[PDB]
C-alpha cells in the first residue's frame, strides 16, 4: 500500500551495426542503380610496321535494382483498466514497439532470409570465409583459435580496398585478452590485471548478438569444450561500400477506428525500410 515509482526492467538491446553500413535514403519504394561488371581489355601490344589495329573486347555495365520491405504489427487494450491504472500503458506499449523494431531490423539486416526481408550478409554467403586450422593435444585434434590467427586475419585484408573495421561478440574479446603463453604471462596487457585498449584505435567495433562461438562463455576448449568447428567468430569489411541500408519512412502509430468494438481500443503501427549487399568482395569472414 506504498507503491513506489521504481520501474526495474532489466532487459537489454544489442549494439547497433547500423552506423557502419552505407546509408541511403529513398522516397518511393523502388530504387535502381548501375554497376560496372568489368572494364575489359582494350588494345594489345601490337607489332610495328602494321597498318592495322585490334578492336579488343568491350566491357560491361549491369543495371540492378532493389525493393523496400515493410514492417507492421498490432496491439490493443481493454479501455477499462486503462482509465484506472497506476501507470500509462500506451507510453509503455509504444516504447515497446521501436524496441521490437530496432532489434528486429538490426538482426534481419544481418541474417535476413530472402523473401520479404532484406538478405543479410550472413545468409548471403558471398563474403569469402576463412576457416582456421585445428591444433593437437595429447594426440587429439581439437579445433582451436589462437591469437596468431587473429593478427593473420585482420592483416590479410587487401590494402587497396581501404580501411576496414571488425565486428565480433565481446566473449571473443574476453577470450583474446585472457590468453596465456607457455610460462604463464599474458599475451596482451602484461601485468595490469586487465587488457582494454581503445577499440576505436584498433578499429574493432563490438556487438552482442553475433553468433558468439564461445557458447555462453563456456567453450574455451581443451576436452569436450572444443569450439565445435564451423562456427562464426568475427567479420571484417569496408562497410561503407560492402553493405547498404535504405530508409523510407520512420515508424508511425495510427488509431484503428473500426475493429475497436467499444471494448478493445486497437492501435496499429508500421514502418518501411530495407537493405541489400553491394559488392561483396570488400569483406571477409573468420571461421573455426
Amino acid at each position: 500500500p506504498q507503491v513506489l515509482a521504481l520501474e526495474v526492467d532489466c532487459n537489454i538491446e544489442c549494439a547497433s551495426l547500423l552506423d557502419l553500413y552505407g546509408q541511403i535514403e529513398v522516397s518511393r519504394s523502388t530504387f535502381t542503380y548501375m554497376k560496372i561488371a568489368d572494364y575489359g581489355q582494350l588494345g594489345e601490344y601490337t607489332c610495328d610496321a602494321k597498318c592495322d589495329a585490334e578492336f579488343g573486347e568491350p566491357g560491361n555495365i549491369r543495371h540492378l535494382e532493389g525493393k523496400t520491405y515493410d514492417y507492421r504489427g498490432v496491439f490493443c487494450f481493454n479501455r477499462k483498466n486503462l482509465q484506472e491504472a497506476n501507470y500509462d500503458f500506451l507510453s509503455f506499449m509504444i516504447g515497446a514497439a521501436q524496441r521490437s523494431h530496432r532489434i528486429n531490423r538490426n538482426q534481419a539486416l544481418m541474417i535476413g532470409k530472402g523473401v520479404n526481408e532484406p538478405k543479410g550478409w550472413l545468409t548471403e554467403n558471398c563474403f569469402p570465409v576463412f576457416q582456421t586450422l585445428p591444433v593437437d593435444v595429447n594426440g587429439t585434434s581439437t579445433p582451436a583459435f589462437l591469437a596468431q590467427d587473429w593478427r593473420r586475419f585482420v592483416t590479410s585484408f587487401p590494402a587497396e580496398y581501404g580501411e576496414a573495421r571488425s565486428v565480433m561478440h565481446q566473449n571473443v574479446f574476453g577470450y583474446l585478452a585472457a590468453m596465456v603463453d607457455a610460462n604463464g604471462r599474458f599475451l596482451f596487457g602484461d601485468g595490469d590485471l586487465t587488457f582494454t585498449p581503445d577499440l576505436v584505435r584498433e578499429r574493432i567495433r563490438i556487438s552482442n548478438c553475433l553468433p558468439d562461438p564461445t557458447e555462453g562463455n563456456t567453450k574455451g576448449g581443451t576436452g569436450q569444450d572444443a569450439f565445435a568447428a564451423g562456427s562464426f567468430v568475427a567479420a571484417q569489411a569496408a562497410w561503407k561500400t560492402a553493405f547498404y541500408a535504405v530508409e523510407k519512412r520512420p515508424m508511425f502509430f495510427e488509431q484503428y477506428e473500426g475493429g475497436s468494438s467499444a471494448w478493445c481500443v486497437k492501435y496499429q503501427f508500421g514502418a518501411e525500410d530495407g537493405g541489400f549487399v553491394g559488392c561483396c568482395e570488400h569483406g571477409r569472414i573468420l571461421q573455426i
Binding site: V135, A178, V180, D181, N217, T218, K219, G220
Partner: peptide, 20 residues
C-alpha cells in the same frame, strides 16, 4: 541460475611440430 563453468584457453602454442 545453475552454476556455469568458466573454461578459458590453456597453454596453446603449436600447430605443426607435435612432440615425440
Amino acid at each position: 541460475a545453475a552454476p556455469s563453468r568458466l573454461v578459458q584457453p590453456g597453454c596453446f602454442i603449436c600447430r605443426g611440430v607435435a612432440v615425440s
